[PDB]
Paper text:
Collagen's structure involves the assembly of three polyproline II helices, with each individual chain consisting of a three residue repeat sequence with the general form (Glycine–Xaa–Yaa). Within collagen's trademark triple-helical structure, three polyproline II helices are stitched together by a network of interstrand hydrogen bonding along the central axis of the right-handed triple helix. The triple helix is stabilized by the backbone NH groups of the Gly residues acting as hydrogen bond donors to the carbonyl oxygen of Xaa position residues in neighboring chains. To gain atomic level insight into these new rules we present two high-resolution crystal structures of collagen triple helices, with the first peptoid-containing collagen peptide structure.
We solved the structure of the CMP 25, bearing the Xaa position NmetG residue, with the sequence [H–(POG)2(PRG)(POG)3(NmetG–OG)(POG)2–NH2] to 1.15 Å resolution. In addition, we have reported two new collagen crystal structures, with the first structure of a collagen triple helix containing a peptoid residue. In the NmetG structure, the void in space observed along the surface of the triple helix in the Val structure is filled by the N-methyl group of NmetG. This prevents the NH backbone–water interaction from occurring and better protects the Gly Cα from solvent exposure, with the nearest water being positioned approximately 3.7 Å away from the backbone NH and approximately 3.5 Å away from the Gly Cα. If there is any other residue present in the Xaa position, this average drops to 3.4 ± 0.2 Å. These observations are consistent with our structures, with the NmetG residue blocking solvent to a greater extent than the Val residue. Beyond solvent exposure, the identity of the Xaa position residue will affect the backbone dihedral angles of nearby residues. Averaging φ angles of Gly residues from collagen structures in the PDB gives a value of −69 ± 5° while averaging ψ angles gives a value of −176 ± 5° or 173 ± 5°.32 In our structure, the Gly residues adjacent to the Xaa NmetG residue adopt conformations closely matching the PDB average Gly (φ, ψ) angles with average values of (−68°, 176°). Comparing these angles to other structures in the PDB, the Gly residues next to NmetG adopt conformations similar to those adopted by Gly residues adjacent to either Pro or Hyp residues.
Author numbering:
A (entry chain A): 1 to 26
B (entry chain B), C (entry chain C): 2 to 27
């Protein structure tokens, strides 16, 4: 029969950097 | 011996990215 | 029984990071 199911793949790579912060105070 | 087992599932989503750059001057 | 299946593929890229730090004062 078929062998045991394989291991789960690796976690994906880190997401991209976030957007820019809000503008500073007036 | 039988054929190789079914392939494992895909990994989970990666970790979130880092924070974005500093915002613009007020 | 056959050999265990191959490891799954890498997961999706992680989510985008958070917002950056607030910008400097006007």
């Amino acid at each position: 029969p078929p062998g045991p199911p394989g291991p789960r793949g690796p976690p994906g790579p880190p997401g991209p950097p976030g957007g820019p912060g809000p503008p500073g105070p007036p």
